[PDB]
A paper describes a structure:
In this complex D4 binds to a unique poxvirus specific protein A20 which tethers it to the DNA polymerase. Three dimensional structure of D4 retains the overall fold of [name] proteins- a central 4-stranded parallel β-sheet with α-helices on both sides.
Here, we report the first detailed view of D4-DNA interactions from a crystal structure of D4 in complex with a non-specific undamaged dsDNA. The structure of this complex for the first time reveals the DNA-binding interactions by an [name] from the poxvirus family. It also represents the first three-dimensional structure of a [name] bound to a truly undamaged dsDNA and provides a representative snapshot of the initial interaction between [name] and DNA. The final model consists of two D4 subunits (chains A and B), a DNA double helix with 12 nucleotides in chain C and 10 in chain D, 4 glycerol (GOL) molecules of which one is in each active site and 118 solvent atoms. Conformations of the two D4 chains in the complex are also very similar with an rmsd value of 0.15 Å for superposition of all 213 residues in A and B. Each D4 chain binds only to one DNA strand. Distortion in the DNA chains C and D such as bending and kinking are small compared to those observed in complexes of hUNG with specific uracil-containing DNA.
Author numbering: 1 to 183, 189 to 218
The structure:
DNA sequence: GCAAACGTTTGC
DNA sequence: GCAAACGTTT
């Protein structure tokens, strides 16, 4: 674990070594933009913007990616709903339920699954307003996704419209599935990932690991 | 000539 | 009244 300083909130950004190559420039960028961003009340709170950089990449082979945080109640961990109230994580969980067969769970969290990194493309939004901070995160979102793509061998993207042309942001031909936003083809997406992983000679994902009991 | 942008459906 | 996907558009 390392740490860097930025001019505006949250002042200190704590990151895992794997992200080193990218921080210098993330700081340049955030310093240009935080000024405005922070004038809006955000989801998540600024202290939580970057907590997912505390996550290692070395041990990750899938990235499950959505466009930006939940309009309200973002925790800084993508997809996470601690009280299991958010529509998107609940639907993901029904999906995983049906593949695995596990039907008696209490919640679900993509961020506790081995080899998986859940990700928000944009790192914050204005409270109640989806994609409202796209222009602030723009180059940062790109910088980071390219970095994640150097480590994972499958990028799974939720949202046909937004990620229709996600390839245009990438510097390699990484395997990329573009599914629907969480709103029965989704099942097929989580299983094809494992098919692809094996064909490519890699360990599959135990999606049942996400379950909270 | 697609990859855009607009409008319509319908799902939350 | 929203946000996403889809079907025609330029």
């Amino acid at each position: 674990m390392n740490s860097v300083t930025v001019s505006h909130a949250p002042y200190t950004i704590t990151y895992h070594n794997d992200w080193e190559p990218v921080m210098s420039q993330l700081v340049e960028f955030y310093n240009e933009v935080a000024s405005w961003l922070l004038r809006d009340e955000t989801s998540p709170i600024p202290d939580k913007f970057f907590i997912q950089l505390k996550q290692p990449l070395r041990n990750k082979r899938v990235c499950v990616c959505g466009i930006d945080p939940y309009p309200k109640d973002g925790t800084g961990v993508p997809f996470e709903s601690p009280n299991f109230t958010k529509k998107s994580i609940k639907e993901i969980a029904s999906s995983i339920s049906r593949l695995t067969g596990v039907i008696d769970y209490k919640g679900y969290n993509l961020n506790i699954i081995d080899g998986v990194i859940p990700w928000n493309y944009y790192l914050s939004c204005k409270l109640g307003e989806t994609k409202s901070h796209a222009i602030y995160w723009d180059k940062i979102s790109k910088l980071l996704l390219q970095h994640i793509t150097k480590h994972v061998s499958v990028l799974y993207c939720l949202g046909k419209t937004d990620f229709s042309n996600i390839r245009a942001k990438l510097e390699s031909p990484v395997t990329t599935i573009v599914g629907y936003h969480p709103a029965f083809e989704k099942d097929r997406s989580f299983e094809i990932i494992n098919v692809l992983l094996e064909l490519d000679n890699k360990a599959p994902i135990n999606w049942a690991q996400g379950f909270i009991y």
